[PDB]
Design a protein around this ligand. Structure first.
Ligand SMILES: [Zn+2]
Ligand SMILES: [Zn+2]
Length: 1287
């Protein structure tokens, strides 16, 4: 158990638990400090830490000590005896809180028992030397006013009050002769400068501080956790494992880069959470090896220690027993000490990954920042930690009896205001970057606000070094994890070996290195004319002495005029915001503009499914202009083209080493040591794959995810600025009214802020999801593939290495040099799938990753889309696309392959994507339009098969071909085995749904089957179990290849590939998404156009057509003529028959050239009667359900409706459209829909039924039924002449 002593500052010195100490950095000179033993080996000195600091530096100045902290100064802190006592009682309380839980009590016990080794690197192996400043510290015994009598004491930790900056707690170790015992296995007296009242403040990005931006936000820290965080540094120092290694160093070459001190791995381990993942596996092992090496030395010393020259009264056995337990060494029956690999592993992991701030916070239910790299905020002062009503040993601030236990409410600034106080900005110093334009206007930006982008030097290159493989050689994995539960329940973690007595010989050798500190300018001036995130956010603010502002979409005007504030919202939002109204309409205006704000912010949930992008925040570019000028042009389009990359302020240069060669050692005649060498090289090979992935994750987190973090913070600010600006305008407009008017104005400001704040929170969730998706995207598409390239390169080199090895040793392997020959091929065949959960256990990061992987659209590895008269890959994997001269492209994403040799597309796929899942798993989707057969060429049409898309690599791969009316999917495994599946449409149908008409194809492949879907419907299936490995990432050639007719061609659109099997549901959705359009379509599926001759087709009367009746103004319905020749293979009804109609636009006299017909458009349905253009009319006064339509010259009669509204009542894909007659555009008086009705005719000669072109009110209710009735006679399609259809 741990005992916390009690005492008051004014208690008498007793030379035992209350002494006059001579601090290590005092150098044996100067005065002593009253010190109190809070627990064994731990001392509290309630005075300011002054070592290495200038007295005047305790005052706030124009300088700062740390560039990444909002430094609070207060020279009066601890200047009275009562203040000192308050410090003592507070430390006593924090220590009691720490030991209130097993985990903290164990941290304390480990610290108390972790006594420094008696000596350091300079001491001979056979001795203990207590006479060094890192082991012995002195206390003055003699009466006051004379250093006549001193006495030495061993100590582990000395805690002082703060140095110049109250909120900059720090643990310091003792260096002597340029070396640190606490970094070389010995350990040494540790010191700390700590302040309990002025705690740090933080806020979660992916969260919301009490869902309030108008109130105080963020949470304040629990000083007990702040203390335990420093105690962890102490722990590492005491065990001599606070080693230095390759540090994370920030890139500072650009003005937008954050400047900070180098960050050591030990600091990231101490914090825990995701930070350890920023330390590559290479560096993890390097640190591991150094500490292990350190322990080897200590254990050798324990085997050689014979005497303690400095102090004859030191019992050697007692210390050997204690050090044996401290380091978990094992001892044989004789007394020989050695390192037990298992116990060392556990101790190491316990100290570096068990005791972490993150683990402790979770355990004590204390909230803390998410990452080391999180924006630091202004500190706050805690009123009274000694008041159990505000802070308790058991629960800290989160007291259940006050209902502050849930959601860390007790630490919430917006909730527990009675626990803290804000700090005077006059006492705060912050390092700023003053960005000046070469003129001049200057903007100050806190260094904290900039982009932290780790420099390339931050990462180890140990992967490039060679590895010697032996029958011994084994894997080396360090789990940056440690079950806190076992640690808390570990039985032999805490020593039960006697702590030696602290009294010893006085220290006479005060030699020690004392650090010297000094402030640096708090402001650094830089020159740049860039208008990036910093300037854009600045343009959205206004001076405090201004109360009348107006919004503007002009960024430059906003920067120029102090009364102009930039807004990235809609033009309409901006105009309404600057609108002035009479008192009577003010409340209405407020409701309006506030509602408009929420609508604008809500646009952050915009979808862009047609471009294969589920979520897009359209205004991010306008708001920050971050990255590659995202404020210019249209952000959505730019994002579709480049993706996540356009938002990054900087594109990092990744460290992706060529893995070092393997040197296998031979064992002539040893059939076992040789077999092992091969197996070990395989396992080692996997270690290289995992390590490389770890190296990627570290760079991603410290150079890419950090930038996206800043963008997220940037948006939160931009949104808040917009709300702040609107709030300001509302206040001004309201205050212009007299008191009498205000009384009759119904307004509630709190609720206004409430609604605005709500809109903001909703937008933040959308933005956070968008940005996280962008970050994972960059990792997966821009980083992982580059690593894979090298790893595959390494594989090959290793393959020819192992084979050649099995050759030179063929003899000593006799009848097996073949069994393992393939053993190598099958091992280096399966690559290691990247799994982020292996490199980190951070819930937020894992969820980000799993979410990304659950989105089917991220499985797209090729997506050919039209852009600037060219086809490019928008999958984000950078496939190279060469479109030769003979290919026809249009902005409707349609491309035509002709019989010309230059009508070809060459696609070189990214060879670095896990495509060969070792069992064939991928899909191909695209739209196609295949022209009708030539009647006089039916034999060749049905006989000649021709390839259209070929993807072959090493005589293996896939292919898409066509033979007449059949489309074929062919696979060819490495063995040459071939399998096919096909879809054949009928060429004898009176009316075909497929011939010369756009339709949707999707082919899916999995371990068992090959399925072909047509317009979302499964059509074919083929068992492909026999088929073996299929190489699919070869070059893709789009070209008509075979014995074709010179006239042969094929149109295609939206060709894409997925590296997974699409489900019927995915396909249906894709079919629906890609079928969607604002415009109507024609019979062939192309956009319906105005001023274009069209024959009419009726879906309910397929074989019927309209013809102006000879003697009357009506359209009789006749039967379509048909294919007349004698071929047995074909049949069809003529399509180019009947009147030739032409659709004319109704509104705006923009002439009759041509344009796209959209749903709901008002039109005139005309047709050519010889050399004249006639019109389709509806007699206004009919009372029956239907009536025949009236066809006549163009004219305007009061008795006939002449205006039609083209509609689309079908919710599902169809090329059919409906034609509605309304009383007039405005009215909701529907006359009826155009269709076909049957009439009975009985005359003097003929008796029969005849159908006519009509209008019926009956259809009005029928088109509402679900599912939509495709057979309805009011369903029409327009057929223009098309080269793809001849009759
Ligand atoms: Zn730290
Ligand atoms: Zn940072």
């Amino acid at each position: 158990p741990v005992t916390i002593n009690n005492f008051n500052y004014n208690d008498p010195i007793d030379n035992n638990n209350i002494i006059m100490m001579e601090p290590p950095f005092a150098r044996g000179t100067g005065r002593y400090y009253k010190a109190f033993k809070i627990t064994d080996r731990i001392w509290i000195i309630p005075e300011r830490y002054t070592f290495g600091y200038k007295p005047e530096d305790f005052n706030k100045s124009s300088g700062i000590f740390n560039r990444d902290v909002c430094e609070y100064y207060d020279p009066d802190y601890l200047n009275t005896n009562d203040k000192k006592n308050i410090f003592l009682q507070t430390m006593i309380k924090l220590f009691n809180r720490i030991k209130s839980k097993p985990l903290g009590e164990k941290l304390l016990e480990m610290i108390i028992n972790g006594i420094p080794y008696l000596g350091d690197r300079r001491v001979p192996l056979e001795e203990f030397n207590t006479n060094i400043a890192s082991v012995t510290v002195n206390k003055l015994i003699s009466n006051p006013g004379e250093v006549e009598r001193k006495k030495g004491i061993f100590a582990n930790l000395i805690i002082f009050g703060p140095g110049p900056v109250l909120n900059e707690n720090e643990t310091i170790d003792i260096g002597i002769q340029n070396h640190f015992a606490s970094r070389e296995g010995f350990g040494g007296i540790m010191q700390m400068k700590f302040c309990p009242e002025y705690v740090s403040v933080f806020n979660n990005v992916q969260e919301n501080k009490g869902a309030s931006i108008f109130n105080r936000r963020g949470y304040f820290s629990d000083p007990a956790l702040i203390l335990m965080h420093e105690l962890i540094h102490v722990l590492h120092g005491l065990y001599g494992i606070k080693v230095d290694d390759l540090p994370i160093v920030p890139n500072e070459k650009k003005f937008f880069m954050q400047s900070t001190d180098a960050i050591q791995a030990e600091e990231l381990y101490t914090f825990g959470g995701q930070d350890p993942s920023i330390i590559t596996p290479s560096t993890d092992k390097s640190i591991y090896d150094k500490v292990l090496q350190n322990f080897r030395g200590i254990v050798d010393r324990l085997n050689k220690v014979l005497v303690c020259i400095s102090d004859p009264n030191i019992n050697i056995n007692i210390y050997k027993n204690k050090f044996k337990d401290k380091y978990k060494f094992v001892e044989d029956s004789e007394g020989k000490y050695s390192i037990d690999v298992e116990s060392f592993d556990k101790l190491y992991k316990s100290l570096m990954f068990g005791f972490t701030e993150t683990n402790i916070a979770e355990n004590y239910k204390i909230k803390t920042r998410a990452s080391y790299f999180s924006d630091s905020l202004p500190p706050v002062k805690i009123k009274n930690l000694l008041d159990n009503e505000i802070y308790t040993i058991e629960e800290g601030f989160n007291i259940s009896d006050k209902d502050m236990e849930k959601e860390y409410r007790g630490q919430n600034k917006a909730i527990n205001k009675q626990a803290y106080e804000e700090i005077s900005k006059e006492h705060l110093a912050v390092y700023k970057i003053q960005m000046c334009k070469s003129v001049g206007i200057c903007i100050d930006v806190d260094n904290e606000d900039l982009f932290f982008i780790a420099d390339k030097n931050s990462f180890s290159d140990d992967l490039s070094k060679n590895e010697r493989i032996e029958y011994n050689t084994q894997s080396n994995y360090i789990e940056n994890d440690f079950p806190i539960n076992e640690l808390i329940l570990d039985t032999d973690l805490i020593s039960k070996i006697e702590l030696p007595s602290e009294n010893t010989e006085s220290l006479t050798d005060f030699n020690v290195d004392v650090p010297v500190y000094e402030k640096q300018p708090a402001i650094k001036k830089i020159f740049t004319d860039e208008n990036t995130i910093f300037q854009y956010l600045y343009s959205q603010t206004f001076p405090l002495d201004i109360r009348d502002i107006s919004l503007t979409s002009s960024f430059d005007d906003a920067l120029l005029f102090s009364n102009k504030v930039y807004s990235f919202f809609s033009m309409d939002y901006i105009k309404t915001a600057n609108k002035v109204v009479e008192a009577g309409l003010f409340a209405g205006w407020v409701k309006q503009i506030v509602n408009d704000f929420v609508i604008e912010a809500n646009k952050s949930n915009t979808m862009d499914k047609i471009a294969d992008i589920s979520l897009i925040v359209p205004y991010i570019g306008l708001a920050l202009n971050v990255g590659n000028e995202t404020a210019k042009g249209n952000f959505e389009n730019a994002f579709e083209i480049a993706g996540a990359s356009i938002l990054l302020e900087f594109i990092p240069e990744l460290l992706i080493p060529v893995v070092g060669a393997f040197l296998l050692e031979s064992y002539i005649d040893n059939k076992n040591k040789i077999i092992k060498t091969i197996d070990n090289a395989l396992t080692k090979r996997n270690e290289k794959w995992s390590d490389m992935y770890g190296l990627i994750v570290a760079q991603w987190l410290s150079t890419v995810n950090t930038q996206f973090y800043t963008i997220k913070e940037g948006m939160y600010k931009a949104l808040n600025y917009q709300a702040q600006a609107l709030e300001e305008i509302i206040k001004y407009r309201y205050n212009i009214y007299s008191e009498k008017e205000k009384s009759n104005i119904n307004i509630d400001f709190n609720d206004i802020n409430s609604k605005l704040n709500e809109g903001i929170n909703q937008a933040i969730d959308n933005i956070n999801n968008f940005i996280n998706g962008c970050s994972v995207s960059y990792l997966m598409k821009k980083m992982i593939p580059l690593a894979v390239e090298k790893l595959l390169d390494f594989d090959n080199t290793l393959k020819k290495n192992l084979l050649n090895y099995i050759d030179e040793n063929k003899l000593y392997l006799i009848g097996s040099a073949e069994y393992e020959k393939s053993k190598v091929n099958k091992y280096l065949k399966t690559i290691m799938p990247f799994d982020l959960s292996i490199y980190t256990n951070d819930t937020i990061l894992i969820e980000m990753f799993n979410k990304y992987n659950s989105e089917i659209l991220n499985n797209i590895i090729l997506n050919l889309r039209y852009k600037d008269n060219n086809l490019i890959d928008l999958s984000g994997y950078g496939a190279k696309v060469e479109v030769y001269d003979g290919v026809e492209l249009n902005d409707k994403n349609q491309f035509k392959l002709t019989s010309s040799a230059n009508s070809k597309i060459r696609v070189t796929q990214n060879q670095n994507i896990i495509f060969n899942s070792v069992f064939l798993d991928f899909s191909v989707s695209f739209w196609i339009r295949i022209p009708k057969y030539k009647n006089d060429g039916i034999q060749n049409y049905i006989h000649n098969e021709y390839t259209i898309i070929n993807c072959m690599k090493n005589n293996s791969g896939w292919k898409i071909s066509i033979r007449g009316n059949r489309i074929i999917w062919t696979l060819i495994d490495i063995n040459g085995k071939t399998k096919s599946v096909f879809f054949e449409y009928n060429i004898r149908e009176d009316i075909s749904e497929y011939i010369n008409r756009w339709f949707f194809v999707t082919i899916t492949n999995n371990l068992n089957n090959a399925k072909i879907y047509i317009n979302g419907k499964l059509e074919s299936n083929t068992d492909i179990k026999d088929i073996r490995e299929v190489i699919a990432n070869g070059e893709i050639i789009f070209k008509l290849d075979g014995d074709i007719d010179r006239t042969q061609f094929i149109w295609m659109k939206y060709f894409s590939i997925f590296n997974t099997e699409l489900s019927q549901s995915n396909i249906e959705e894709r079919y629906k998404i890609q079928s969607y359009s604002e415009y109507l379509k024609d019979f062939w599926g192309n956009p319906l156009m105005y001023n274009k001759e069209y024959y009419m087709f009726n879906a309910g009367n397929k074989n019927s057509y309209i013809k102006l009746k000879k003697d009357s103004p009506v359209g009789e319905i006749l039967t379509r003529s048909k294919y007349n020749q004698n071929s047995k293979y074909i049949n069809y009804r003529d399509l180019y028959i009947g009147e030739k109609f032409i659709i004319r636009r109704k509104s705006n006299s923009q002439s009759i050239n041509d344009d796209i017909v959209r749903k709901e458009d008002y039109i005139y349905l005309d047709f050519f009667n010889l050399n004249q253009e006639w019109r389709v009319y509806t007699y206004k006064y009919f009372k029956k359900e239907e009536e025949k339509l009236f066809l006549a010259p163009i004219s305007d009669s009061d008795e006939f409706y002449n205006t039609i509204q083209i509609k689309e009542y079908d919710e599902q894909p169809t090329y059919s459209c409906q034609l509605l007659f309304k009383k007039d555009e405005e009215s909701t008086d529907e006359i009826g829909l155009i269709g076909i009705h049957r009439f009975y005719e009985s005359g003097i000669v003929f008796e029969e039924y005849k159908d006519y072109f009509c209008i019926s009110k009956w259809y009005l209710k029928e088109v509402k039924r679900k599912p939509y009735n495709l057979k309805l006679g009011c369903n029409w399609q327009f057929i223009p002449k098309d080269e793809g259809w001849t009759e």
